[PDB]
């Protein structure tokens, strides 16, 4: 939006939270003190509605972040979690019961899949899978006991973009009361306005772009009015919360999210365009790159891109080639996570990807390189990638 940067700078900032400073105060607390029985009664009644009650419900610092997330993502409430994986697992758990069925994209984050197959399965909840490009044909997979439809767009690692309008419309035709969820981390919740598309809950690893500096972990889940109270109370029954200081740092990260994302978009698309012309590259998976799976949906449904994408090499690198390649970069660092200022590089063997694509078939045989494009000078990053190519030519 033409006002997103203004919204990012101001979200969640009310005087009761900031008390004269630009940023919210950091209120560290378990105990929250009631001056009177009447104040305790009021706090108890409103213990889930932004009145100070107990640290597990939140302090002023959490309330400020929650207000900011609800403004930016257009929700009725925002639940907070110790990390992105906890947000996914506990948001699903909040809405299933024995006998229910979960329908999840087979490009979902691997720990999200493992939560379903290793935790939910033993509790009486089953999981089916769908191709990210299934579109309207997802109506054929919905069962009488299907309670949750779980999206992730772009998909993890391989970056396939859903046709969310087609998927949502099909779901609402067959099972209108289904809970549609999305892991919206890649878009940082702001490049894809999930709730505006009829999705019920938008989950983020705020660990990534919201924190923005690779030094804090936190999950968020913003729900519409229909689903908020069940999410809030069931997640609370699991004790899910984040510490006040990380909440403060997430609010703080919001303030620069627009400037950062614009640079990640510009730099990563430039890199992807170069890779797509490169003799040692077989495929480029960047939602903003014409030709990538689901690109047309990204162009239609997103307001921008972030900096995480991947590409396929011309070959399945051996262990020895992978070391020659990855061990000798000067700028890219080998690490998990993404969304920070540091450019990162991560390799996945085609067979490794096949193993996390349930009931699907991988359509590449070269090693998949996932890049996070950070804030470095893009020409320096290209030179680093070029040196890597020369080590394996």
């Amino acid at each position: 939006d033409k006002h997103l940067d203004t919204a990012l700078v101001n979200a969640g900032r009310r005087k009761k939270y900031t008390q004269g400073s630009v940023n919210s105060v950091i209120q560290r607390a378990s105990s929250l003190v009631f001056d009177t029985v009447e104040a305790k009664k009021h706090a108890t009644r409103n213990r889930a509605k932004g009145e100070l009650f107990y640290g597990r419900r939140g302090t002023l610092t959490h309330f400020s972040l929650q207000e900011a997330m609800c403004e930016l993502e257009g929700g009725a409430g925002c639940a907070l979690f110790p990390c992105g994986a906890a947000a996914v697992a506990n948001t699903i758990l909040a809405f299933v019961e024995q006998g229910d069925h979960v329908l999840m994209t087979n490009t979902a984050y691997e720990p999200s899949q493992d939560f379903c197959t290793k935790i939910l399965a033993k509790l009486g909840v089953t999981t089916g899978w769908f191709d990210p490009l299934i579109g309207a044909d997802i109506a054929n997979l919905i069962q009488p006991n299907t309670k949750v439809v779980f999206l992730e767009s772009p998909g993890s690692i391989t970056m396939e973009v859903h046709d969310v309008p087609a998927i949502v419309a099909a779901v609402r035709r067959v099972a209108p009361e289904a809970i549609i969820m999305i892991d919206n981390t890649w878009a940082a919740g702001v490049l894809f306005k999930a709730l505006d598309f009829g999705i019920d809950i938008s989950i983020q690893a705020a660990t990534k772009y919201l924190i923005g500096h690779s030094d804090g972990m936190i999950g968020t889940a913003v729900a519409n009015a229909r689903c908020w109270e069940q999410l809030c109370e069931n997640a609370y029954l699991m004790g899910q919360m984040i510490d006040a200081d990380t909440a403060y740092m997430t609010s703080r990260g919001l303030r620069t999210l627009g400037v950062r994302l614009r640079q990640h978009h510009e730099s990563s698309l430039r890199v992807a365009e170069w890779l797509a012309q490169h003799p040692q590259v077989a495929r480029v998976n960047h939602p903003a790159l014409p030709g990538s799976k689901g690109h047309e949906f990204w162009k239609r449904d997103f307001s921008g891109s972030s900096g995480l994408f991947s590409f396929v090499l011309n070959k399945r690198l051996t262990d020895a080639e992978l070391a020659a390649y990855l061990d000798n970069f000067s700028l890219f660092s080998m690490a998990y996570s993404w969304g920070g200022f540091e450019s990162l590089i991560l390799a996945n063997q085609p067979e490794h990807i096949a193993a996390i694509r349930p009931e699907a078939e991988v359509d590449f045989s070269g090693t998949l390189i996932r890049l996070h494009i950070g804030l470095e000078n893009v020409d320096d990053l290209l030179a680093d990638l070029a040196a890597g190519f020369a080590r394996i030519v």
Copy 2:
């Protein structure tokens, strides 16, 4: 132990964590960088064994705390959680599946009960209850599908102490492979060496005495070798972790835990002795006070007391009397939680207690006052309590 204070000062402090300082470093991270493919392979193999892999598994700061908790509580591993309630809920969840049965003391922390009745019940796991003084007679409640026996000693609010040796021995006779758990928060994990008694897992709201200052929330679960790997991996599948700074503050709280607990013991027992002689007091629930329920077990099985206890007034105070009493204390603060330097006061109506004692009957009709005795001068606290009594005489 005659060396507990020395152990508390030194636990978890190895050079790889402290790097020259007295306290561990604070390493804030999601991304942890691998210098080489060989280093990444080593990190992956040992990602649950204290090698840096990914922030969700921990940084140096978490590893230091985990080592400290395992030393002090005599366990094989320590899982970390965003708060005490999350530790309880996810430690139980890590070991049950559809069709299992949980046997829990009916004096358990109310959110622990609610996790069982509102979350587990809809996932196919049932919960039965037992009186805290059931002792060896608990063998009669164990069912072929009973997987978890959940203790809490002293109990929440009413402070009844289990006969843990009797309970454990009975459980091992009937269902030797049962997972015995205890919420050991009141003892701060160190006044009752749960694992030495044959309990499998010792859970704490480190929020309380370990943090020690009412300004940080965190849960811990220390497991023996038999149960560690299931606890660790299933809790991780739920995304459970704590932030690095709170881990640092928990290690830091350990260093003064002995001096603090000795003062909480001395002051709270003095207060309890006075209350037990008081014309406006009907009953005193302090494990260290002769006559309290389970006291003989506390004397035999614990190495000390903390500062949390409760007493029963001569009457069920009306709302108006409760305000006259609680609104006008000068030192005691009305708040939830405990284990800090501030003395706290909290009232529970006898009928409120009855409502959180499933399949049991309350044996008092006066208002129950729970006190946390902090680090204030004990005579000032007695004067505050005396003024309170005069307001309701």
Copy 3:
């Protein structure tokens, strides 16, 4: 071509990061010596990045110090509780009874007050110069002039020095004088002071380095000639910063390039728009043509930040000042700058005259200082336009 890469990587060595992207936070007073020989080695190297005592620093400070030295091209970086402490203690480190300080009359007011209220009673005199004096500063250098203190752009009124002409003139008369600059507006990276022959570059890292209005810290990066005296005399005054703020300063560096580019783009737009506005008499922005010293900014800087000022076409009454300043929707009234929030402050001409020693001001309208943050510039323009309508 490379500043953004340098900002991302500065100060990051494994001994400081230990596996993470950012340096570890090592909170410490006591630092433990395993042996007498280790203690002797730490003592010898207590100003050279071996752990010795928290007042000298921990790994977190060492990482920031290395980053600042790399980015500003210096031999060492002293750390301070705030920018004002960096200014006061850096000057103090190089003067003694009988010395003379020559300071631009556009210096930050607390810097001036340090000179007139602290240094003077300790036997150090201060004289003043117009910021556009250029080579004619040679005529003001006295036999006892020890420090020449620059600030470019100047505080509030934003005049840009001709640093090459000033430095050449100083070195002709007093080759060994200590030339210092408060380089906060450039965040130490838009103007590479040490490459111009300045000896010490001082920053309120509070501003753009922290970048979020929520941490205070001063830095002073010195060349090889001046470092040891700066380091040891600041240490004798106990000057340090806490490890956590040091960490947050290193962390701020990483986004400094992308932030500054936005502040530049937006503040230049606003300045160009104000320059055309009928209710504006003059715009003081280093990057705007016609502003005092603009030609030196264009020649000597690699960019602009977001702080500047303008003069209204009239002197506002007290009622008009309240109507104007009390009713902005986005601009906040506050001191400091360099964050994501846009800020506004007002000064009457006589207020500025009072902090322009031996000079008069050349305007009569109310002066407005703006910090242009990261909001959408069109929203900021609409906020300013609404303000103009309240005083028209």
Copy 4:
């Protein structure tokens, strides 16, 4: 009867805590004024606890300042990056060219070095006195003596002043002199300096107030006569502490009483045991009978902390120093003190002589300084006994 209650409650008002037990942490440079009138009011009250600018403080600092004033009985509390900064800047706030400072020759070495290496070149002279001089200090007061600087117990050698006799003597000759004390060993609460007619009580809050060896901060609590000058001259040098360390200092206060009682009990036991040991020539513990000034400690203090020293029955060789110090299991070799960890340091007699201006030392054995932490005292005794066996 009430210190523990005071420590738990000091500085805690709803405007600072806003519902929590501890004060909020307000990180800020910029503090926002909603209106011109609010800005005027904040400006008027910028040293009196109205939010104005982060260099003056936020709510977190105000809470700590109120706590320190309540606990030490003062009119205001200035905050500094560390103890050495508090000492240096508190002295500097009250001197000018031509003044004379009279300091105990047992002062902390960096305090002495500030005087001889910074003040001297700024026209301020420093003279010295034996810590047991008592009323005879009157003979050392010069017409230009402005500051009398006490430290009781003394650094390392632990001599306790007769503060009533010193203060009475000073006030007879120079009633308006500024009497200051470095009151770190007493943590400001075991010796209520301002009640004895001292004007300013300075602490390295780094030590027992923080209490965990992981934060650095200085404080100076002044009476009504001296506060404004302290406050404003320290502010002109930019002296402040970050909000987070201020929070951690308030937090440390809450356990200070229970910690100090353990440090007292354990360090007195160790001192009594060392005094009986055949390899110990002398024990310097304020609470131990026979120690220099013990009678004044017993009369004037309400307790002891855990730092003291002793003299070995011989001068250790370099080989014996390594054998002794390199092989402790619990005691760590490090600077600072006041935490939960027990610490050990050694000094030869000539090292102490070098920091005893105009005095000679009266011992020839190696001096060992111990900080007694929170470990089990019998384990610490076993550690010390093993050390004795390594040098016997």
